[PDB]
Amino acid sequence: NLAPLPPHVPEHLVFDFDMYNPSNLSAGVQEAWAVLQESNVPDLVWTRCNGGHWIATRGQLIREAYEDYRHFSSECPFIPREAGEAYDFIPTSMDPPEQRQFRALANQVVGMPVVDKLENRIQELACSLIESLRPQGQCNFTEDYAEPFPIRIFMLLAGLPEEDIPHLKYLTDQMTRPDGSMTFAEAKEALYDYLIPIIEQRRQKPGTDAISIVANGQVNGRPITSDEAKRMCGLLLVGGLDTVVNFLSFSMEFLAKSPEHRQELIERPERIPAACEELLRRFSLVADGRILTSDYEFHGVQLKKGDQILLPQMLSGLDERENACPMHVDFSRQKVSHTTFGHGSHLCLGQHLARREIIVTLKEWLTRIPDFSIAPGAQIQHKSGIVSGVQALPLVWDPATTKAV
Ligand code: HEM
Ligand SMILES: c1ccc(-c2cnc[nH]2)cc1
């Protein structure tokens, strides 16, 4: 389903990429997207899928568009338009300087200090889940660890019931990797039907959880409104539920195939941090974009006010002009260039949480289960969308090679 090419688009800039269903999906998600960086594809292309939009395919362009909020606005950050239109998440749907007050608050809830505080639970939960897995010789990493780990830590943080996971997780999946079962607005509304009664309660009777801190916070000297709180909380949910979850599966899938990488980390633990950056570069997974605020000429292409452009954060680090041998995971790269957690004013506030969770998972898993692989005859499937994922990850191992700690 291709939308008719608008007038201002040179037919030579057409490249019909479906961000919801790239062509080389079988090969892997990052590999499927990276077709945008072949010699045949211009730096800035137009796809007729998902109703027509620009895509910047290079690190240099993505970074620039990101920095440039004057021209490229977050007002409508999602493709398709209706999805970007229906989204009113804060601070994500706002530009500086408005953005800034809301961000400062969100930072209170997720920043460094909170991670430092939660660190012992993070470690506790990872050890406990792993130890629980170990003797079995087999899981579903996606369901058995990558889902529970990051999620139970978020629920804890936000003061929400474990019982709500199944429910929330579905709604969140609908937003980043729309199924067709429900539109974006419906998905947004139901998540919202959820939070509303909750924020009500925490404005009345405050706790120490994130929702309470958000719901009772100050923004530009006055108190945040219920609607504003609803809107920040929405973002927190998706970030909390949907990101690290998918990140871990790509990473683990990689580790399950690369014994030598496992070993390197086992013998030279001082490398964990450096490896974490490299996996963040290679298994980058977020693709969103911006809306043009006017007619503007970018890198020789004429953009019309109201044109949406996808600025795949995933693509910067997979670019050869930024990283030599981009598809190759190398723990000792002198410089790991990426924009995994974004660029410009919208840099991810929850990056600290995310890294802490990755490093723990690697350090702890490898410790107990140093030798593992993918189940013989399992075919791993990735999924594409705003945030990409792994469908299932069946792992197998000999319990006899594990070590209980
Ligand atoms: C490994 C996982 C993660 C990745 C790759 C990721 C990536 C991103 C990206 C690319 C952006 C900017 C989007 C834009 O510019 O449109 C962003 C923003 C955001 N992220 Fe993350 N994120 C992750 C995890 C998290 C977590 C765990 C949280 C906290 C619950 C979170 C909270 C946020 C917030 C609050 C913003 C908005 C910042 C602003 O608008 O000022 N993220 N993230
Ligand atoms: C949709 C909404 C939120 C996000 C996100 C921000 N940080 C992590 N995930 C990604 C897509």
From Swiss-Prot:
Swiss-Prot/TrEMBL cofactor(s): heme
Keywords: Cytoplasm, Heme, Iron, Metal-binding, Monooxygenase, Oxidoreductase
MF-aspect GO terms: camphor 5-monooxygenase activity; heme binding; iron ion binding
Pfam families: p450
PROSITE patterns attached to this UniProt entry: CYTOCHROME_P450
Catalytic activity field: 2 reduced [2Fe-2S]-[putidaredoxin] + (1R,4R)-camphor + O2 + 2 H(+) = (1R,4R,5R)-5-hydroxycamphor + 2 oxidized [2Fe-2S]-[putidaredoxin] + H2O
Gene Ontology CC terms, in alphabetical order: cytoplasm
Binding site for heme: 348
Subcellular localization: Cytoplasm
EC number(s) given by UniProt: 1.14.15.1
GO biological process: (+)-camphor catabolic process
CDD domains in UniProt: P450cam-like
Xref: SUPFAM superfamilies: Cytochrome P450
EC category: oxidoreductase
Pathway connected to this protein: Terpene metabolism; (R)-camphor degradation
Membrane-spanning residues: none
InterPro entries reported in the protein's UniProt record: Cyt_P450 (IPR001128), Cyt_P450_B (IPR002397), Cyt_P450_CS (IPR017972), Cyt_P450_sf (IPR036396)
Gene3D superfamilies, alphabetized: Cytochrome P450
Role summary: Involved in a camphor oxidation system.
Similarity section: Belongs to the cytochrome P450 family.
Protein name (Swiss-Prot/TrEMBL): Camphor 5-monooxygenase
Organism the protein comes from: Pseudomonas putida (Arthrobacter siderocapsulatus)
